[PDB]
Amino acid sequence: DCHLSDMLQQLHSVNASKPSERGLVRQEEAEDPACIPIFWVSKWVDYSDKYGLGYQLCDNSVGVLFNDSTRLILYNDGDSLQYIERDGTESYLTVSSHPNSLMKKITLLKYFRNYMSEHLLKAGANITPREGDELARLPYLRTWFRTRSAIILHLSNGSVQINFFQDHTKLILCPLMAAVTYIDEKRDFRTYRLSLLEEYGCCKELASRLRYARTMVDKLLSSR
């Protein structure tokens, strides 16, 4: 949509400025704490051979994008559910009210939540998300895919997250803030305004990852 189209242009503008080819790179000047994300994917499990893709958002809400194209999200209170059917029908309910048709999906989500809780590390554990609007909605996973080098996650708030498998580095791109958060190999988390990276530049690691990110957003837009 337009979130992705906006993000492609923001990336293209940075990359076209050749930011790792500044005489003096002042990456630190492109930092903006006001732009840190409200939400990102802190854990995920690909069980798409059988069920779907389960994930945890940094607020400890969990969701699943099931093989049948439905989506179920358990809020961080551990009771409140949001269910999205194939036709887009959206329902708000509780695990504790007793919806018979959803009990198998509920127990599947509880399985993912419990797996991720026992076994997986929380990405960005050290980071406080920025403050989000009082009446804003919790995002869900719109789309995802993997390449041989990363998993790409597209959230319904327009964010795109990219986890690089080999060195554990991660980007979180928000087209609304026009910002990227980079989590480096030593788990340092930095958030930059893309237009400032155009002004001040950045290192060859971040530059290289932003060029890859643009290729991923093109894949997103190609699937449509």
């Binding site: 995920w44 069980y47 991720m116």
Partner: peptide, 5 residues
Amino acid sequence: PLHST
């Protein structure tokens, strides 16, 4: 990979 780190 089949799950996160």
